[PDB]
Amino acid sequence: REIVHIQAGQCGNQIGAKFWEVISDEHGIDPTGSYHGDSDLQLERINVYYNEAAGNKYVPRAILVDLEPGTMDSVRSGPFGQIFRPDNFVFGQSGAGNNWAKGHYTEGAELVDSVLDVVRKESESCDCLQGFQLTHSLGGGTGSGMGTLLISKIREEYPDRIMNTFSVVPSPKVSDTVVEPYNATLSVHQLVENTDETYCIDNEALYDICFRTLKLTTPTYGDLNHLVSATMSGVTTCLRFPGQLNADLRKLAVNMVPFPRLHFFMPGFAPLTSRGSQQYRALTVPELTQQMFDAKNMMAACDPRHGRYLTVAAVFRGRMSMKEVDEQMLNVQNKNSSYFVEWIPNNVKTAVCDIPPRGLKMSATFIGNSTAIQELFKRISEQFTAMFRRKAFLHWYTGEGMDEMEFTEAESNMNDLVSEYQQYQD
Amino acid sequence: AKLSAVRIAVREAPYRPSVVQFPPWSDGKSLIVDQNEFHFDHAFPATISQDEMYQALILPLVDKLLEGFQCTALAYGQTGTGKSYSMGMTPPGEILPEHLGILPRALGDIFERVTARQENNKDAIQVYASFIEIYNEKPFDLLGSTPHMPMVAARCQRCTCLPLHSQADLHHILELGTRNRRSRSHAIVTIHVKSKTHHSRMNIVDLAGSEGVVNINLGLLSINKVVMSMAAGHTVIPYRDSVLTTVLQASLTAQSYLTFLACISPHQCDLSETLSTLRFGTSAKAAALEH
Amino acid sequence: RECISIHVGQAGVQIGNACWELYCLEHGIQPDGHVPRAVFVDLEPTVIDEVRTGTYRQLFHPEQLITGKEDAANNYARGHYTIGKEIIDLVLDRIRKLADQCTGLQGFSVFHSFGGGTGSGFTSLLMERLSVDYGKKSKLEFSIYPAPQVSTAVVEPYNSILTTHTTLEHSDCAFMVDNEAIYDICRRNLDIERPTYTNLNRLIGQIVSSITASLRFDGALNVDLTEFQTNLVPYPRGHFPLATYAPVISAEKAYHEQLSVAEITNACFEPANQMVKCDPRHGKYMACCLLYRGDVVPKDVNAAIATIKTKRTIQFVDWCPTGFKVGINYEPPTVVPGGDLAKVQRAVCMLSNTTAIAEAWARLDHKFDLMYAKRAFVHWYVGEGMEEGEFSEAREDMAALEKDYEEVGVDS
Ligand SMILES: CC(=O)O[C@H]1C(=O)[C@@]2(C)[C@H]([C@H](OC(=O)c3ccccc3)[C@]3(O)C[C@H](OC(=O)[C@H](O)[C@@H](NC(=O)c4ccccc4)c4ccccc4)C(C)=C1C3(C)C)[C@]1(OC(C)=O)CO[C@@H]1C[C@@H]2O
Ligand SMILES: Nc1nc2c(ncn2[C@@H]2O[C@H](COP(=O)(O)OP(=O)(O)OP(=O)(O)O)[C@@H](O)[C@H]2O)c(=O)[nH]1
Ligand SMILES: Nc1nc2c(ncn2[C@@H]2O[C@H](COP(=O)(O)OP(=O)(O)O)[C@@H](O)[C@H]2O)c(=O)[nH]1
Ligand SMILES: Nc1ncnc2c1ncn2[C@@H]1O[C@H](COP(=O)(O)OP(=O)(O)O)[C@@H](O)[C@H]1O
Ligand SMILES: [Mg+2]
Ligand SMILES: [Mg+2]
Ligand SMILES: [Zn+2]
Secondary structure (H helix, E strand, O other): OOEOEEEEOOHHHHHHHHHHHHHHHOOOEOOOOOEOOOOOOOOOOHHHHOOEOOOOOEOOOEEEEEOOHHHHHHHOOOOHHHOOOHHHEEEOOOOOOOOOOHHHHHOHHHHHHHHHHHHHHHHOOOOOOOEEEEEEOOOOHHHHHHHHHHHHHHHHHOOOOEEEEEEOOOOOOOOOOOOOHHHHHHHHHHHOOOOOEEEOOOHHHHHHHHHOOOOOOOOOHHHHHHHHHHHHHHHHHHHOOOOOEOOOHHHHHHHHOOOOOOOEEEEEOOOOOOOOOOOOOOOOOHHHHHHHOOOOOOOOOOOHHHOOEEEEEEEEEOOOOHHHHHHHHHHHHHHOOOOOOOOOOOOEEEEEEOOOOOOOOOOEEEEEEEHHHHHHHHHHHHHHHHHHOOOHHHHHHHOOOOOHHHHHHHHHHHHHHHHHHHHHHO | OOOOEEEEEEEEOOOOOOOEEOOOOOOOOEEEEOOEEEEOOEEEOOOOOHHHHHHHHOHHHHHHHHHOOOEEEEEEEOOOOOHHHHHOOOOHHHOOHHHOOHHHHHHHHHHHHHHHOOOOOOOOOEEEEEEEEEEOOOEEEOOOOOOOOEOOOOOOOOOOOEEOOOHHHHHHHHHHHHHOOOOOEEEEEEEEEEOOOOEEEEEEEEOOOOOOOOOOOOHHHHHHHHHHHHHOOOOOOOHHHOHHHHHOOOOOOOOOEEEEEEEEOOOHHHHHHHHHHHHHHHHHHHHOOOO | OOEEEEEEHHHHHHHHHHHHHHHHHOOOOOOOOOOOOEEEEEOOHHHHHHHHHOOOOOOOOOOOEEEOOOOOOOOHHHHHOHHHHHHHHHHHHHHHHHHHHOOOOOEEEEEEOOOOHHHHHHHHHHHHHHHHHOOOOEOEEEEOOOOOOOOOOOOOHHHHHHHHHHHOOOOOEEEEOOHHHHHHHHHHOOOOOOOOHHHHHHHHHHHHHHHHHHHOOOOOOOOOHHHHHHHHOOOOOOOOOEEEOOOOOEOOOOOOOOOOHHHHOHHHHOOOOOOOOOOOOOOOEEEEEEEEEEOOOHHHHHHHHHHHHOOOOOOEOOOOOOOEEEEEOOOOOOOOOOOOEOOOOEEEEEEEEEHHHHHHHHHHHHHHHHHHOOOHHHHHHHOOOOOHHHHHHHHHHHHHHHOHHHHOOOOO
16 A cells, blocks of 8 residues: 655645654665664555665655745755655745735645646556645645645545645644634635545644653754654554554544544544653553543644544554453543443544554554544634634735635635534534 | 435336336335335336326425425436436427426426415515536536536535526526536536525436446435434534535535435346435435434 | 365454464474465455465465455445455455365355454455355354454444345354453453453464364264254354353463363353353353363263253253254364463363344444444445445344344243
C-alpha cells in the first residue's frame, strides 16, 4: 500500500519538516542517505512514504505547496531539507497574502495545475495507492485556501483513495492571526466535504500538554510540531507495520466514521512523560489508557469530558497482551459509560502493532471521534459572525474576486456541521 | 428533525411467466420474487394505469407542496422498466392522454389548487420548473445558456427556473432540456412553488439505469444514509456523499416528503436486477423508521 | 479421507499458523519436511507475509498463500462483494487444484474470524462457492465469533450478522471458539494476565488438533468428519457447536496432572472451561462429541459419561435420549515444548450444540440493531455494492435463528 503526504502552506510545511524529521528516523533514512535502520523491519513497508531511484536514496513522496518562497526556502535550506526531490517544491513566488481567497481563487488557483501535475506523478508512482496525508493551518492563505483546494481536486481525481487531514484549527485564547475565523470557517467547509479523516490540533492545547505534561518551560514551535508529528506517525506509518491486530487508514476510517460528514478526530499520544525524572516506566498499559483517555493530553482544544464519543481508536504499537489491551478498553468503556455514546456497543477500536516508537518500550496513538469537537466549530463559527456581521476585513477577500454569498455558505455549512454532531451527544 | 414521511412503491413493467408474484391474499402492498417476500407502501402490477398510480402515490403530496413542504418523488431501477414513462419525462404534447406521467399530472393539480386558492389568498403564488442532469457525478443546468458546463457550490440553489403558466410551458422546458441533454445520466425536474415568504419544491427524479456491468448507484444509496443520519441525529448529514443528495439537500430536510418508485422487470432474464432493486426498497423502508 | 482447510482473514491465518504448528509438532515433521494441505487468504498482504517471513516459512507453497495487496477493510460488503470478489476465483482455483490432487476427500476445514472484513465477507462467498461446487462433502467451518463485551472492530456485528446469514445455508457444522471466554481460561485455568494472541491460537491450536489431526488418525473409536455433522447437527441450519478442552492445566503452577478420566470429563461441563462465553445459562445440550485422546479405557468413559447422564443439572434436550458420541484416539495430546500448556497423558475435546447459543446469537443480534437503527457505518457498505436489502434481509435471517435455537429446545 501507499500514501503521498501534502505540506500545504507554511505551517503545514513547517510541520512537514517535523513529520519527516521523525518518520525518517522511525525508518532509518538519513538526510539523503538510505536505510541505516537499526532493524530490518523498518524497510519492508517503507514504500508507503518513499520511492526507489538510486539505491540509497529513498525520497519522501510528499508535496510542498506554498506561495511564500522564504518558507520552503527555510525547510529546504536546513536539516533534512535536502531529501525532497526539487520536483516536489510547488512554490508560488506570488504574494502569499494571508487571504483564504487569495490562495484559493486568485493566486493559488494558478499554481494548482502545476501541483496536481505532480500529485499525479507521485500517485502513479507504483503499486497501489491508499490515500494522501495533508498538513496545514486553517488560519491563513496558503494553508486553508490553497490547501483546501488541493484536496477538492484530489477528491475528484481519486474518490477511491482516502484523505487524512491534519488541521491546525485556530486556537482559542489567542489567535496567531486576525481574520483567522475567515480563513478557517472557509477551509473547514471544504474539509467537511472532501477529506474523510481529519486530525485537528491546537497550538495551545499543545502548549498546555507540552508545558505541564512535559515540564518543558520553553516549548518552541519545533516542539509542538514535533509532538504532533509523533501522533501522525503512530497513525499511518505505524499500522503499516505488523501486529497481532493491525489496521490501516481504512479500518481506522471504516471504524471511526459513523456518518459521512467525514468527522474530525483529536489525536493523543501515549507515553508523554517529562525526560529525566518522570521516566517512571509506568507503562504496563493501564498507564497508557490512563494517559490517552484523560482530558488534558488531547491535542484538541476541547475536552472529551464535555461530550460523548462515537468512536475511538487506540492504535497501540509495542508488545502487549491482547488481553490486558482488550480488557482495559472495557473498564474504560464502563467507568465512563456516561460519555461514550450508547448506540455503539463497542465504540473503541483496539488496534495493535508490534514494533514501538524506536526508542520507547510501549506507546499507543489515540484517535478520538468525540462529539466534544462541537464546542470548537462553535467557537470558530462564533468569531466569524461577530466579525462577519460588520464585514470586518472582508474587502481583502472580495477585492480578490470572492462572493458575499461564499462566506455565508461556509459558515452555514460548517455551522450546520456543529448542529449534526450534537444529534449524537443526545 | 425527521422527514414527515418516507414512502416506497414498486411498479411492475409491462410483460413482453412473470417473476413478479402478487399473492392471492395480501394487503396490496406485497410481492414475491424468487421466493422472497417484499413489503412496501404500494405494489402496482403491470395493469395499473398512470392515473391510478399518480392518484395513489403523488396526488397526496400536492397538498403538502402547497402547504410549503419540500417533496421528492424518485424513480429508480433497471433501464427499460418504465421510470421515464412513470415520471412523465417525455414532452406531454407527444404523448397520448392516458399515458401522461407524474410531472404533467402533478402540474395540472398544482395549477388548479393555486387558482382555487387565489382568492382566499394571503400572498400570490408563482410556479417554475428547473431541469438538472447529473452525468458522472456532475450537475448540469439544462435550462441555462451553458447546459454542457458543470456546476459547483451553486447547483443546490443557483440554477435557472423557467416560468410555468400551463402545460404548454412544461412541454417547452422538457423539450428544451431534452435537447440540451447529452455511463449514467440522472434527471431531476423540479416544480417550484414560490411566494414572497415561501418556496416549496416538488422534485421529480428519474435516475439512470441501476444495472451494473462511486458505483453507479450511490445517490439513493447516499439517500438512505441521509435518511438514517437524520433519524439518529448524527448532527452531520452526509449530503456531499453524492451529487444527488447535494442537489436535493434543501428537500432532504425535516418535515419534507420522500417517495421512492422502484420500477422492475417481470422478465426472468432480469431477475438479478429486479432483486437488487427490491432489496434496496427494503433497506430504504427500514431507514424510513423513526420518521 | 482427507479434509482441506482454508484459513481466511488475518486471524484465521494467525490461528492457522498456530493450528498448523501444533501439527508437525506431533507428527515429527520439522520446519522443512512434507507438504501441507490447505490455503491462506487475506486482502492485507502484510499478514500472510508473516507466514512468508516468520516460522513455518518453507513448509508452504507460495501457491497456497493467496493475497490481495489491495485493501482489507473491516467491512463485510467490501470484502464479500467489491474487493473480495476479485480474488475468489483464484482462491477457489487452489481449493479445486488442491482438492483434485488428493484421493477421495471428505471436506474443507475453514478457518475464519466472524467479525472481520476478509474473514466475514470473503469466506461468506468462499463457502458460498463451495456449497455448490462440492455440495457432496463436509463444510465444517471453525469460527472465532465476537467477544461478548470485548469486541474490537466498531462494526463487528455488521460483519458477523452477515457472515452468519450467508454461510448458514452453506456450512455443515460450524465450530465456535469465543476469543474472550478463552481469556478467562488463561486467567482462571492457567493463570497469566499476559496472554498474547499467540496463545489463544495455541489453544484453539489444541482443541482443533483433537478434531482433525488425531481423529483422522487411527484409534479405538474413530470418528470421521462426516460423523460429526451427523452425530452433531440435529437440523440443517449449519448449526454451531462449541469447542471445549479438558486438561487445560498450567505447566508450571499446579500439578495434579494425573487426573483420571473421571475428572477430565467432568471438567468439560463446568462452564468455566469452554472457549465460549455461552455459559450453559439454560441451553440444553442436544448432542456432544466427546473426543478423547491418550490412555483411556472405554469403560472408564462408558461410565464417566453414565455418571454425567444422570446429573440432571446438566439437562439434555427432550427429543434426545442419548446424545454422546464417544470418540477415542490413542496418541495422547502434544503440548508446545515450552509454552504454558500442562502436558497431560489424556484429554477431552468435547464439542456440542447447546440451546445456549440462543444467548450468544441474541446478544450479538441486538448489537447490530442498535447501530443499524441509526445506519451507523452503513454508508461504508452501500458504497461497496450492498443495499438496505442485504442488511435488513440478513437481520430477518438470524431472527429465525433466535427462534430456531429456541424451538429445538426449551419445549417438549
Ligand atoms: C533516554 C530515553 O529513553 O529518552 C526518551 C525520553 O526521555 C522521553 C521523555 C520522550 C522524548 O520526547 C520529548 O521530549 C518530546 C519533545 C518534543 C515533543 C514531544 C516530545 C524524546 O526526546 C523522544 C524519543 O522518542 C523516540 O525515540 C520515538 O521513536 C519518537 N521519536 C521522535 O519523536 C523523534 C525525535 C527526534 C528525531 C526523530 C524522531 C516517535 C514517537 C512516535 C512515532 C514515531 C517516533 C524518546 C523515547 C526519548 C527522547 C529522545 C529524550 C517522550 O516523547 C516521545 C515522543 O517518546 C516525551 O515523553 C515521552 C517519554 C520518553 O521516555
Ligand atoms: N483467537 C484469536 N482471535 C483473533 C486473532 N486475531 C484476531 N482475532 C479476533 O478476530 C477479530 C479480528 O478480525 P481482524 O483481524 O480485524 O480482521 P480479519 O478478519 O483478519 O479481516 P479484515 O477485517 O479484512 O482485516 C477480533 O474479534 C479479534 O479479537 C488471533 O490470532 N486469535
Ligand atoms: N503547530 C504549529 N502551528 C503553526 C506553525 N506555523 C504557523 N502555525 C500556526 O498557523 C497559523 C497561521 O497560518 P500560517 O501557517 O502562517 O498560514 P500560511 O502560511 O499563509 O498558509 C497560526 O494559528 C499559527 O499558530 C508551526 O510550525 N507549528
Ligand atoms: N406501464 C407502462 N404502460 C405502457 N407502456 C410502458 C409502461 N412502462 C413502460 N412502458 C414503455 O416501455 C418503454 C420504456 O419505458 P421507459 O420509461 O423509457 O424505461 P426506463 O426510463 O426505465 O429506461 C417506453 O416505450 C415506455 O412507453
Ligand atoms: Mg429513462
Ligand atoms: Mg487482516
Ligand atoms: Zn499428581
